[PDB]
Amino acid sequence: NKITKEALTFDDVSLIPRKSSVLPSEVSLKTQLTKNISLNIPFLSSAMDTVTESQMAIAIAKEGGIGIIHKNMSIEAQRKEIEKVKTYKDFPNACKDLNNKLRVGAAVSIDIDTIERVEELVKAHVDILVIDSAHGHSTRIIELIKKIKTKYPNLDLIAGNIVTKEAALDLISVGADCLKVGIGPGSICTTRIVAGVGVPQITAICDVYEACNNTNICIIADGGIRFSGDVVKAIAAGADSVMIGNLFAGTKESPSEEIIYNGKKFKSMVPYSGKLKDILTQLKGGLMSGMGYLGAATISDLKINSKFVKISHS
Amino acid sequence: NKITKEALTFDDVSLIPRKSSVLPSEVSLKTQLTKNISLNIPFLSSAMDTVTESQMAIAIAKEGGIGIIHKNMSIEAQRKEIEKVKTYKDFPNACKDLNNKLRVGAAVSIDIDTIERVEELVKAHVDILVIDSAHGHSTRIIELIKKIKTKYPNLDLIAGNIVTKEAALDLISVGADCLKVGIGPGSICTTRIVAGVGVPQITAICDVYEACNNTNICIIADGGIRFSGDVVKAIAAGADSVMIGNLFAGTKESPSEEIIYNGKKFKSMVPYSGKLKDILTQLKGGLMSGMGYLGAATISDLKINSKFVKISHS
Amino acid sequence: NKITKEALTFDDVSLIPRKSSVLPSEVSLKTQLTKNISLNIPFLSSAMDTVTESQMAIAIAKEGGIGIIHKNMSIEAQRKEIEKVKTYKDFPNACKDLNNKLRVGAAVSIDIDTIERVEELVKAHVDILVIDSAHGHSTRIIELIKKIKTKYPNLDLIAGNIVTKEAALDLISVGADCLKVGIGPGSICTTRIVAGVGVPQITAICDVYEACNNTNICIIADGGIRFSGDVVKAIAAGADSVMIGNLFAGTKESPSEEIIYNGKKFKSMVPYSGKLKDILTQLKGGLMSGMGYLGAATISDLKINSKFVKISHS
Amino acid sequence: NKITKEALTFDDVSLIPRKSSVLPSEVSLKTQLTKNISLNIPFLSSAMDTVTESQMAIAIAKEGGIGIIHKNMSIEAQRKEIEKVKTYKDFPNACKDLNNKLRVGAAVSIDIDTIERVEELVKAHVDILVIDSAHGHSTRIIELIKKIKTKYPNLDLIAGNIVTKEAALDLISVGADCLKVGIGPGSICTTRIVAGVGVPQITAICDVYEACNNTNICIIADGGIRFSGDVVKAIAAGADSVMIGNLFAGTKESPSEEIIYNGKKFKSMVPYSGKLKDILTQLKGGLMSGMGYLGAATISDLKINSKFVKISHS
């Protein structure tokens, strides 16, 4: 069967209201990044050199999520960034480790000095590592996870991007603690255009979720988040958290520099968004509203007691 | 089954002509708001602070429909507005109460002084009350209906916005006299965007209708009416009446103020539409034409003897 | 079953090539308007006051089709127009009656003097009459056909616009010689917008055709023709001929007046198209090409030996 | 069954990642044009007078593909062009014949002197011939193949454009060595617009492929290639190679002349693309990336071990 099935994106679907007993304000946004690391808000900042470095990591950890420092920098640079976050100086939801230090992660891809990079990152006391690949379901990435897990047994791992059930089983089999889902979710995406490859996000999430169900392996929904409603759908589909890049690129904390163009403000050029905190408030508000609509008091309820209708567009 | 089914909006559907015996001019637009209150034309003006106050209420009641005064005002203000309508000074279709006073309704939402608001509204002799909620299928709204119906047994109630059969059963169970259907009908709608929640209007209407069928509970189709054809489809789907906001926002009677911008006219800014009466004539004309096409002499015939074909767009 | 089925427009479908033995130039465009009146090219000019009067009628009859004089004029005027065509003064395909006079038809709708109008039209020796209604499936139109067929037994009749099998049976039952199919074929169409009524053209044609099959009643596909490819699809769906309005509105022969706007030319304002003959050549060429692709030597072959694939757009 | 099925274009589909063991750089782009002629890269330059003449043919053959000289020129001219390519003077992938001369093909259509044209082309030592027709599934083209194969038994033939299984069987039956697939793939295409004929490319390819499977007859996917991802999908659907026109029209080597418009560069007017070699590098890169995503080391693996999901758009 060449054409296996129809895949759904965020816009091909909508959530059906349910009898509710909770108000958006009584809802809990706590979730799991891994079985060992929880988050206070289900958001992660992308490992893009355009969105996450020490300032973004600190800002979002103080809000309850976690930032993943990008790998497009020297090994020394990446270590220092981790240390900046870890040695930081009200924020009720701040996410800290058992040593009261702000949480933070770092991305790494296959290179000649990956092991060397990881070693330095672990010395900086990074909380979690992201094996960053465009195609996580590969023999090279599988072997890379094995090596890292043998050399650093207690280092939590989020394994490369996948969109299938078979990929989830393989990565889990070698110790992946969390699976990051997301490959060619949109027609405008580079993988879809260049390689003609990819699977719509809702189907992607539902697929790996319908595989990792009953297990203690978490799921991160990475990419394509345009609105708070997308976060709601991503979690209802089965994600434990969501990784965001674009929507944060214009914030003050992004690695970019602030530019004032004829009375207007930008980051360089994307329009200024203000403190990350403001965008996050907007996003958690929408998530809470959505949970109110579905009668979910926790993230876990949103994932199990939720149903969609297919949108014939128009 | 996560993805329960495909939902239809107004544009995903079209009505199939039927053998007709009546001319658009011989058709009756009479319908029911509740089992105790009928209307001469199946239209209601939205409880939006941008469309319905005393002037809109009077204008549409004189035409045969009913206006619902918005709640974004003091309790004293809302009472006075009701009195203005009720103490008003040819219009053959005017809709009046047994005391020959123009019909009028008022919206109320959950607040610290809802009961207090209702008391004053009932003193003003309001004909019907709208429990205004974005999510009517909630324990708080259900309890609110119980309280209001115990304190004011003869006050007709339209209960919060719903899009499901289960919600219809719950609200009906506590005395709702009419159900207002409408939640995230369009992708551009705030609930769909912010909360990722919502169900296309035709499916929404068909769903609660296919539940309240055989009962004496009426249905109001609220929101998304862009053209007269949408009204026809809404009723054919099962609605007894339709609530309109946007299309009336530019009329003279809307709470807005008239503004003349360089030779053009506006309401503030939406383009001027003229007397509500003119827009209504356009809307009832289209409804009559549609009923002529389906051989329906009454609103009731439009709802039972009507079928759609699904539009594959294009 | 409220939502009976999915209906198809011209764009939701495409024709599948077949083994061909004929060249576009060896193909025959001859078809039937009624069992008694044939045409040399399967085209009719719309009974719109913006496209068909004596000049359009003459021009298209000289090409092999037939024009239908619109009814938006006095009874005396409409009679004279018929006479102008009938008393006209190389064109190998010219379509003439047994008396060597150019063919021509006239539209008539329900009015106080329809019978009176017809009488004068019949005196002018009109070849065929069009009972022009937006909803042909009505008791009034059915009775009108009965009356006309009793008072003028040999007058060929095309009966009002329909889109259903039941309508086809009723109109046929009272003597309709040809059925004109076409109601709310497009979302932008006035009936779809105003009355929320209508059925996509391909399904409409297929539907009445799959009813009038095996009978001697012909089918005219009226409206929505934008390209020559639409004509091909319309006939493959089951039409014997196609009625065109818009595409002819800009021709020299249309009732409009020629206007020169800053070096450009128009009809009043639609852009000038030139002699009808030129547009017709373009349209018959495309039809012939399409028949070549399907191995159809005649119109009849195009209708029976033809299959479509559904276009999922994109 | 008038409406046989739903057909898919490039955009209605996306490829599903698979467990991979190969890196894009370790992949082999070698493929077959016919059982007797292989190519080093699965690309052909269109037989359009706007893209392929001696310069385009040389450029792409030096890269590993083959150019097909267009037929819109005198027989003498077309012969000379072949000779220029065949007598050409690092490029590791160059595609040459057993005599170390650059490969090249030539298009021919039904005319009064087709046989005469072929004779001269064969004297020029053309490697393969393209029977160029808009509708290859015709008795005239079938007879033309028979004649050419009797007069030139060792001349490899690519037979006219088809989109069906029945056409593939007929052309194969008279000696076609390769089948070129492609007719009205897009709604904007001239055949779809003018003749209302055509079948989406993915379904077209899958259809003839699911017929020529298990045979030694190759398939060329001709037309509609906008991005490298389209090439990947075309091959995964069953094509052995892909014919490209538009994307090459702006290259330096195209028959066009270079024009500098106010600081910008063009070909005449389409924007300059630079050396074909650069566009090809972009296209083979995307193909390799796509093969990496599917774990295909060869073109053959891409065709057999590949699956798509249907894109509900949005």
Side-chain angles (χ1 to χ4, degrees), chain A residues 2-5 7-75 77-79 81-88 91-111 113-118 120-168 170-209 211-213 215 217-256 258 260 262-268 270-311, chain B residues 2-5 7-75 77-79 81-88 91-111 113-118 120-168 170-209 211-213 215 217-256 258 260 262-268 270-311, chain C residues 2-5 7-75 77-79 81-88 91-111 113-118 120-168 170-209 211-213 215 217-256 258 260 262-268 270-311, chain D residues 2-5 7-75 77-79 81-88 91-111 113-118 120-168 170-209 211-213 215 217-256 258 260 262-268 270-311:
Chain A
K2 268 288 184 185
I3 325 297
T4 61
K5 58 176 178 181
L8 315 163
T9 73
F10 291 133
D11 305 311
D12 299 319
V13 119
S14 191
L15 287 162
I16 307 172
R18 297 207 323 154
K19 186 170 192 172
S20 178
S21 301
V22 297
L23 296 286
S25 57
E26 309 168 349
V27 147
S28 178
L29 298 185
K30 167 182 176 172
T31 188
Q32 302 295 134
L33 181 48
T34 66
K35 68 165 189 176
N36 310 298
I37 307 179
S38 76
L39 290 177
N40 291 331
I41 60 175
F43 303 90
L44 290 76
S45 66
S46 189
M48 279 158 60
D49 66 4
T50 213
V51 356
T52 304
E53 261 171 44
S54 68
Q55 288 304 148
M56 172 66 62
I58 292 175
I60 193 167
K62 288 164 68 183
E63 293 304 315
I66 194 172
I68 294 173
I69 314 290
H70 70 90
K71 61 176 178 56
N72 198 58
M73 58 171 78
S74 59
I75 293 181
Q78 217 192 358
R79 175 179 173 178
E81 290 302 291
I82 298 300
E83 288 169 355
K84 289 186 181 178
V85 183
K86 284 297 192 181
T87 59
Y88 183 63
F91 311 76
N93 312 298
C95 202
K96 306 176 180 182
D97 54 32
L98 291 174
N99 277 289
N100 232 190
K101 300 310 174 182
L102 286 175
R103 292 291 204 176
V104 71
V108 83
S109 62
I110 289 184
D111 252 59
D113 45 54
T114 308
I115 301 295
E116 180 188 355
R117 183 173 287 275
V118 180
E120 233 49 46
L121 295 180
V122 173
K123 284 181 184 173
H125 293 147
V126 60
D127 307 78
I128 186 158
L129 190 72
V130 172
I131 307 299
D132 220 25
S133 171
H135 187 43
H137 201 190
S138 57
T139 54
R140 300 180 180 180
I141 262 61
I142 287 184
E143 284 301 305
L144 212 213
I145 298 174
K146 283 185 173 182
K147 304 184 203 301
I148 292 180
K149 273 318 186 69
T150 288
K151 293 178 180 293
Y152 307 91
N154 290 141
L155 215 211
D156 274 303
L157 288 204
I158 289 165
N161 281 37
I162 62 165
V163 295
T164 66
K165 172 200 59 184
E166 312 76 54
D170 277 32
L171 289 190
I172 278 180
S173 292
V174 285
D177 302 294
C178 181
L179 300 170
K180 197 143 66 62
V181 174
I183 301 181
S187 308
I188 61 178
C189 318
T190 291
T191 292
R192 288 281 285 280
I193 295 305
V194 179
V197 173
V199 177
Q201 201 67 146
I202 293 295
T203 294
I205 299 169
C206 275
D207 276 4
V208 324
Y209 175 69
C212 294
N213 190 185
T215 79
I217 306 302
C218 304
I219 299 177
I220 293 179
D222 177 25
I225 299 297
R226 305 152 301 173
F227 317 99
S228 59
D230 297 330
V231 178
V232 179
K233 297 175 185 173
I235 298 177
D240 292 294
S241 61
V242 97
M243 179 170 258
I244 298 187
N246 189 65
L247 294 185
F248 292 165
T251 55
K252 174 183 291 299
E253 293 85 342
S254 61
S256 323
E258 277 172 44
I260 302 297
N262 60 296
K264 307 170 186 176
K265 207 193 198 74
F266 302 81
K267 272 312 213 74
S268 248
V270 54
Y272 192 61
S273 304
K275 250 73 145 45
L276 167 77
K277 176 170 49 191
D278 295 324
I279 296 299
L280 278 179
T281 295
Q282 177 230 88
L283 290 172
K284 40 215 291 271
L287 206 206
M288 295 167 100
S289 168
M291 293 173 75
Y293 273 107
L294 281 74
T298 68
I299 296 300
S300 163
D301 289 312
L302 184 51
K303 305 195 305 168
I304 68 169
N305 311 309
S306 176
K307 289 185 181 180
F308 306 92
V309 284
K310 287 185 285 187
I311 299 312
Chain B
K2 268 288 184 185
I3 325 297
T4 61
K5 58 176 178 181
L8 315 163
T9 73
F10 291 133
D11 305 311
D12 299 319
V13 119
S14 191
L15 287 162
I16 307 172
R18 297 207 323 154
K19 186 170 192 172
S20 178
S21 301
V22 297
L23 296 286
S25 57
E26 309 168 349
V27 147
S28 178
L29 298 185
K30 167 182 176 172
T31 188
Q32 302 295 134
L33 181 48
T34 66
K35 68 165 189 176
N36 310 298
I37 307 179
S38 76
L39 290 177
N40 291 331
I41 60 175
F43 303 90
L44 290 76
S45 66
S46 189
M48 279 158 60
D49 66 4
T50 213
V51 356
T52 304
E53 261 171 44
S54 68
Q55 288 304 148
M56 172 66 62
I58 292 175
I60 193 167
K62 288 164 68 183
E63 293 304 315
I66 194 172
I68 294 173
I69 314 290
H70 70 90
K71 61 176 178 56
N72 198 58
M73 58 171 78
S74 59
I75 293 181
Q78 217 192 358
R79 175 179 173 178
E81 290 302 291
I82 298 300
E83 288 169 355
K84 289 186 181 178
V85 183
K86 284 297 192 181
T87 59
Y88 183 63
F91 311 76
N93 312 298
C95 202
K96 306 176 180 182
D97 54 32
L98 291 174
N99 277 289
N100 232 190
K101 300 310 174 182
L102 286 175
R103 292 291 204 176
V104 71
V108 83
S109 62
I110 289 184
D111 252 59
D113 45 54
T114 308
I115 301 295
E116 180 188 355
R117 183 173 287 275
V118 180
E120 233 49 46
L121 295 180
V122 173
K123 284 181 184 173
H125 293 147
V126 60
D127 307 78
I128 186 158
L129 190 72
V130 172
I131 307 299
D132 220 25
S133 171
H135 187 43
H137 201 190
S138 57
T139 54
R140 300 180 180 180
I141 262 61
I142 287 184
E143 284 301 305
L144 212 213
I145 298 174
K146 283 185 173 182
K147 304 184 203 301
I148 292 180
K149 273 318 186 69
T150 288
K151 293 178 180 293
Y152 307 91
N154 290 141
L155 215 211
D156 274 303
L157 288 204
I158 289 165
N161 281 37
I162 62 165
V163 295
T164 66
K165 172 200 59 184
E166 312 76 54
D170 277 32
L171 289 190
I172 278 180
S173 292
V174 285
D177 302 294
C178 181
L179 300 170
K180 197 143 66 62
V181 174
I183 301 181
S187 308
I188 61 178
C189 318
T190 291
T191 292
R192 288 281 285 280
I193 295 305
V194 179
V197 173
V199 177
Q201 201 67 146
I202 293 295
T203 294
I205 299 169
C206 275
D207 276 4
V208 324
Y209 175 69
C212 294
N213 190 185
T215 79
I217 306 302
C218 304
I219 299 177
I220 293 179
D222 177 25
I225 299 297
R226 305 152 301 173
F227 317 99
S228 59
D230 297 330
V231 178
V232 179
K233 297 175 185 173
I235 298 177
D240 292 294
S241 61
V242 97
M243 179 170 258
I244 298 187
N246 189 65
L247 294 185
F248 292 165
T251 55
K252 174 183 291 299
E253 293 85 342
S254 61
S256 323
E258 277 172 44
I260 302 297
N262 60 296
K264 307 170 186 176
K265 207 193 198 74
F266 302 81
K267 272 312 213 74
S268 248
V270 54
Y272 192 61
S273 304
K275 250 73 145 45
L276 167 77
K277 176 170 49 191
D278 295 324
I279 296 299
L280 278 179
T281 295
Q282 177 230 88
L283 290 172
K284 40 215 291 271
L287 206 206
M288 295 167 100
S289 168
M291 293 173 75
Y293 273 107
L294 281 74
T298 68
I299 296 300
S300 163
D301 289 312
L302 184 51
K303 305 195 305 168
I304 68 169
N305 311 309
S306 176
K307 289 185 181 180
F308 306 92
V309 284
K310 287 185 285 187
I311 299 312
Chain C
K2 268 288 184 185
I3 325 297
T4 61
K5 58 176 178 181
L8 315 163
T9 73
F10 291 133
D11 305 311
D12 299 319
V13 119
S14 191
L15 287 162
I16 307 172
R18 297 207 323 154
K19 186 170 192 172
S20 178
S21 301
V22 297
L23 296 286
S25 57
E26 309 168 349
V27 147
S28 178
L29 298 185
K30 167 182 176 172
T31 188
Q32 302 295 134
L33 181 48
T34 66
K35 68 165 189 176
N36 310 298
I37 307 179
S38 76
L39 290 177
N40 291 331
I41 60 175
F43 303 90
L44 290 76
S45 66
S46 189
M48 279 158 60
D49 66 4
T50 213
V51 356
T52 304
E53 261 171 44
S54 68
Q55 288 304 148
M56 172 66 62
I58 292 175
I60 193 167
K62 288 164 68 183
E63 293 304 315
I66 194 172
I68 294 173
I69 314 290
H70 70 90
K71 61 176 178 56
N72 198 58
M73 58 171 78
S74 59
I75 293 181
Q78 217 192 358
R79 175 179 173 178
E81 290 302 291
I82 298 300
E83 288 169 355
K84 289 186 181 178
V85 183
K86 284 297 192 181
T87 59
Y88 183 63
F91 311 76
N93 312 298
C95 202
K96 306 176 180 182
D97 54 32
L98 291 174
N99 277 289
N100 232 190
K101 300 310 174 182
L102 286 175
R103 292 291 204 176
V104 71
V108 83
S109 62
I110 289 184
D111 252 59
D113 45 54
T114 308
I115 301 295
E116 180 188 355
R117 183 173 287 275
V118 180
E120 233 49 46
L121 295 180
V122 173
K123 284 181 184 173
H125 293 147
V126 60
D127 307 78
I128 186 158
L129 190 72
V130 172
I131 307 299
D132 220 25
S133 171
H135 187 43
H137 201 190
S138 57
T139 54
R140 300 180 180 180
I141 262 61
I142 287 184
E143 284 301 305
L144 212 213
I145 298 174
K146 283 185 173 182
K147 304 184 203 301
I148 292 180
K149 273 318 186 69
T150 288
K151 293 178 180 293
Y152 307 91
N154 290 141
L155 215 211
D156 274 303
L157 288 204
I158 289 165
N161 281 37
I162 62 165
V163 295
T164 66
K165 172 200 59 184
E166 312 76 54
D170 277 32
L171 289 190
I172 278 180
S173 292
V174 285
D177 302 294
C178 181
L179 300 170
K180 197 143 66 62
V181 174
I183 301 181
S187 308
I188 61 178
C189 318
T190 291
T191 292
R192 288 281 285 280
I193 295 305
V194 179
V197 173
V199 177
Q201 201 67 146
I202 293 295
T203 294
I205 299 169
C206 275
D207 276 4
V208 324
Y209 175 69
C212 294
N213 190 185
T215 79
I217 306 302
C218 304
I219 299 177
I220 293 179
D222 177 25
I225 299 297
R226 305 152 301 173
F227 317 99
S228 59
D230 297 330
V231 178
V232 179
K233 297 175 185 173
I235 298 177
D240 292 294
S241 61
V242 97
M243 179 170 258
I244 298 187
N246 189 65
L247 294 185
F248 293 165
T251 55
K252 174 183 291 299
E253 293 85 342
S254 61
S256 323
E258 277 172 44
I260 302 297
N262 60 296
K264 307 170 186 176
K265 207 193 198 74
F266 302 81
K267 272 312 213 74
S268 248
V270 54
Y272 192 61
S273 304
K275 250 73 145 45
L276 167 77
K277 176 170 49 191
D278 295 324
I279 296 299
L280 278 179
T281 295
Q282 177 230 88
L283 290 172
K284 40 215 291 271
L287 206 206
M288 295 167 100
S289 168
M291 293 173 75
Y293 273 107
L294 281 74
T298 68
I299 296 300
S300 163
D301 289 312
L302 184 51
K303 305 195 305 168
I304 68 169
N305 311 309
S306 176
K307 289 185 181 180
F308 306 92
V309 284
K310 287 185 285 187
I311 299 312
Chain D
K2 268 288 184 185
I3 325 297
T4 61
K5 58 176 178 181
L8 315 163
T9 73
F10 291 133
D11 305 311
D12 299 319
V13 119
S14 191
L15 287 162
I16 307 172
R18 297 207 323 154
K19 186 170 192 172
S20 178
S21 301
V22 297
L23 296 286
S25 57
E26 309 168 349
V27 147
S28 178
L29 298 185
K30 167 182 176 172
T31 188
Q32 302 295 134
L33 181 48
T34 66
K35 68 165 189 176
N36 310 298
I37 307 179
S38 76
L39 290 177
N40 291 331
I41 60 175
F43 303 90
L44 290 76
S45 66
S46 189
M48 279 158 60
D49 66 4
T50 213
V51 356
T52 304
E53 261 171 44
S54 68
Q55 288 304 148
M56 172 66 62
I58 292 175
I60 193 167
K62 288 164 68 183
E63 293 304 315
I66 194 172
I68 294 173
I69 314 290
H70 70 90
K71 61 176 178 56
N72 198 58
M73 58 171 78
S74 59
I75 293 181
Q78 217 192 358
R79 175 179 173 178
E81 290 302 291
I82 298 300
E83 288 169 355
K84 289 186 181 178
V85 183
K86 284 297 192 181
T87 59
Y88 183 63
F91 311 76
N93 312 298
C95 202
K96 306 176 180 182
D97 54 32
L98 291 174
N99 277 289
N100 232 190
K101 300 310 174 182
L102 286 175
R103 292 291 204 176
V104 71
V108 83
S109 62
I110 289 184
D111 252 59
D113 45 54
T114 308
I115 301 295
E116 180 188 355
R117 183 173 287 275
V118 180
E120 233 49 46
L121 295 180
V122 173
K123 284 181 184 173
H125 293 147
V126 60
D127 307 78
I128 186 158
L129 190 72
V130 172
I131 307 299
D132 220 25
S133 171
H135 187 43
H137 201 190
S138 57
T139 54
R140 300 180 180 180
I141 262 61
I142 287 184
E143 284 301 305
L144 212 213
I145 298 174
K146 283 185 173 182
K147 304 184 203 301
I148 292 180
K149 273 318 186 69
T150 288
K151 293 178 180 293
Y152 307 91
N154 290 141
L155 215 211
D156 274 303
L157 288 204
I158 289 165
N161 281 37
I162 62 165
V163 295
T164 66
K165 172 200 59 184
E166 312 76 54
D170 277 32
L171 289 190
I172 278 180
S173 292
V174 285
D177 302 294
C178 181
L179 300 170
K180 197 143 66 62
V181 174
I183 301 181
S187 308
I188 61 178
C189 318
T190 291
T191 292
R192 288 281 285 280
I193 295 305
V194 179
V197 173
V199 177
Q201 201 67 146
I202 293 295
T203 294
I205 299 169
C206 275
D207 276 4
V208 324
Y209 175 69
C212 294
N213 190 185
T215 79
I217 306 302
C218 304
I219 299 177
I220 293 179
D222 177 25
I225 299 297
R226 305 152 301 173
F227 317 99
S228 59
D230 297 330
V231 178
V232 179
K233 297 175 185 173
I235 298 177
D240 292 294
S241 61
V242 97
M243 179 170 258
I244 298 187
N246 189 65
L247 294 185
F248 293 165
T251 55
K252 174 183 291 299
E253 293 85 342
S254 61
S256 323
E258 277 172 44
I260 302 297
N262 60 296
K264 307 170 186 176
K265 207 193 198 74
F266 302 81
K267 272 312 213 74
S268 248
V270 54
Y272 192 61
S273 304
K275 250 73 145 45
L276 167 77
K277 176 170 49 191
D278 295 324
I279 296 299
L280 278 179
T281 295
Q282 177 230 88
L283 290 172
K284 40 215 291 271
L287 206 206
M288 295 167 100
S289 168
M291 293 173 75
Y293 273 107
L294 281 74
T298 68
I299 296 300
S300 163
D301 289 312
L302 184 51
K303 305 195 305 168
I304 68 169
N305 311 309
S306 176
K307 289 185 181 180
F308 306 92
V309 284
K310 287 185 285 187
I311 299 312

